[PDB]
């Protein structure tokens, strides 16, 4: 599972949905100021979430899913919250809902596996 998005920036967290909204706006204010996004590819799996440069295919971000807490698609932006302490990545995409849906599904499966390994039957 790999989708294309445009990296817009990221804020840091020292409710989630709101913290996402606030991450989206913060990004937007900076964007609005610098204005008058870099091409990336989000690789999704049950093991992690990697952000590769859409050109160099070089690894920008690599988060093992368990370090990833919340994911939210707000219209056309994707907010990934991973553990200043917490970090909020703001991406913009056409498939912003499918990226979130996909990452949430990844969560579900990864969690079933986690439960499974602990002797709990999922």
């Amino acid at each position: 599972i790999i989708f294309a998005a445009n990296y817009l920036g990221s804020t840091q967290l020292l409710v989630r949905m709101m913290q996402a909204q606030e991450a989206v706006s913060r990004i937007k204010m900076a964007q609005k100021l610098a204005k008058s996004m870099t091409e990336v590819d989000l690789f999704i799996l049950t093991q992690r979430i990697k952000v590769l440069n859409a050109d160099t295919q070089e690894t920008m971000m690599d988060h093992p899913l368990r370090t990833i807490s919340y994911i939210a698609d707000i219209g056309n932006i994707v907010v990934l919250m991973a553990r200043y302490k917490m970090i909020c990545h703001v991406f913009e995409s056409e498939d912003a809902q499918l990226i979130a849906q996909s990452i949430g599904q990844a969560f579900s499966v990864a969690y079933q596996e986690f439960l499974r390994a602990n002797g709990i039957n999922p």
């Binding site: 989630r16 368990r66 807490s69 939210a72 707000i74 219209g75 969560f107 990864a110």
Partner: peptide
Amino acid sequence: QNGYENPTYKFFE
């Protein structure tokens, strides 16, 4: 609009 939490995160947090 749409948000999703990772039930596994608690466990290593």
